[PDB]
Design a protein around this ligand. Structure first.
Ligand code: WAQ
Ligand code: WAQ
Ligand code: MG
Ligand code: MG
Ligand code: MG
Ligand code: MG
Lengths: 251, 251
């Protein structure tokens, strides 16, 4: 059966390219017969965003010719913290636990404010202590991963986590990304003003949720992948953009 | 001054060197966005040229102010076969002001332009193609015709209220208005529609009921240009100038 990559991005004050504000992004992986439902889902997701009404949006589909790999979601643990500063401290400890040196963590945190506007993810090289990709404000956009809702809902029931598509999306991405042999860890929180939970993820500790990573009403987010590998960055960028992943949980 | 949006679509098969299946352009208020994205989607998905494996749909705010014009006057020439239609087409182009030699040269090149995805600009002073877009063609966009007014026009005009005619006539009308455009020649690349037209400022929109045989995918869109200025000026006008059609019943 043939699957399709469906992607969306939306911005205001022009195309993202112009120097507009990123509003929303989406990526889906589906059989052809879900095309209409999926295009509408992405349209609606872009139109009803807390960051604002877009004046630019692109939606796109194409056939995927690489074969699909189906994986488990990462194990999930929720860390309850009382404030953003405690969440950020915990985040740094978790990154160090997973194998990132403290020094590389500090260098990344120096740039993170600069990367608030990035539309995808930043790749940070642990060998240089510096950004590895050259996409600048565009970022690297991981795509061609998805998680059928029914299975995701079964997973959320069991995990005592709410069945919000925001978590599905985050965990599908974290799971695809941590599977990459060159990715040691990911740090994330949302650019949406209305969601303060973030996470750190890696192969050892799984998907570590942190219930407060920033204040409500702020639009600064973070998506950094810490890279430890022997290959060029374009190889890895191609892996993240092109490798098709479906999530399927079983107990 | 109400805000309008350019909504565009293109679809192809065997990739993004692929076969062009469908193209669309709309110009609408924001509240029509959902209906319009779905219309373009469905248009692309149910095309007689085939099922796409690639599609892009895009919207953006238009910042130039909209000009509203009347549609060209319409006349329908009933012919009994394609060869009679083509012969009429050439007579009408000549009557509107294109010299015979320029018509003959263009007809010799029309077969090699079957694959062009937009329009060809043909210079009447040089008897040569003027634009440099090759297989891409020049894609006129940011024109539309609100459905209600189009339906009233079609009722009165004794022409069927098909969106194909709406789209053709909105384009022909925007294009003929351009002071450098002497005439247009058109028939569809769709295997399932053999009606075509020639259009110009004097003769209006002259429909010709048979311009090719059913089941053929060779189409034509040629703009005959009489102009001193940089072709890129004209191209920019055709791509960027926002036009709405309003037929005035009161007349
Ligand atoms: N597909 C992607 N590829 C690379 N970076 C991405 C991608 N998607 C999002 N990002 C980056 O992350 C930033 C925020 O993305 P968002 O979709 O706003 O991210 C979230 O909602 C994070 C929620 C995690 C906690 C969920 C939970 O377990 O309760 C976003 O602006 C991008 O810069
Ligand atoms: N927006 C455009 N800008 C430039 N060229 C275009 C555009 N739209 C279509 N074309 C070119 O023309 C070709 C034919 O497009 P189509 O939309 O398939 O053409 C038609 O339906 C023609 C119908 C005319 C008769 C209507 C009537 O019954 O009164 C198409 O493949 C392109 O090469
Ligand atoms: Mg997202
Ligand atoms: Mg966001
Ligand atoms: Mg068309
Ligand atoms: Mg066509």
């Amino acid at each position: 059966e043939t699957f399709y990559s469906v992607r969306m991005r939306a911005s205001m004050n022009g195309s993202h390219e112009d120097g507009g504000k990123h509003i929303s992004g989406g990526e889906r992986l589906i059989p052809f017969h879900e095309m209409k439902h999926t295009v509408n889902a992405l349209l609606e997701k872009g139109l009803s965003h807390s960051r604002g009404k877009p004046d630019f949006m692109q939606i796109q589909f194409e056939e995927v010719h690489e074969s699909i790999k189906t994986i488990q979601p990462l194990p999930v643990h929720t860390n309850e913290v009382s404030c953003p500063e405690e969440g950020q401290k915990l985040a740094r400890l978790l990154l160090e636990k997973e194998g990132v040196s403290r020094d590389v963590i500090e260098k990344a945190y120096e740039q993170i404010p600069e990367w608030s506007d990035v539309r995808g993810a930043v790749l940070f090289d642990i060998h240089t202590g510096k950004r590895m990709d050259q996409t600048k404000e565009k970022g690297v956009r991981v795509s061609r991963m998805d998680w059928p809702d029914a299975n995701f809902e079964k997973w959320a029931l069991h995990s005592h986590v709410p069945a919000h598509s925001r978590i599905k999306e985050a965990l599908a991405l974290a799971s695809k990304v941590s599977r990459h042999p060159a990715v040691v860890a990911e740090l994330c929180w949302s650019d949406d003003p209305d969601y303060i939970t973030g996470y750190v993820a890696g192969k050892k500790m799984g998907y570590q949720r942190i219930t407060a990573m920033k204040e409500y009403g702020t639009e600064e987010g973070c998506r950094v992948f810490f890279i430890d590998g022997s290959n060029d960055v374009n190889t890895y960028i191609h892996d993240l953009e092109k490798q098709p992943i479906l999530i399927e949980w079983e107990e």
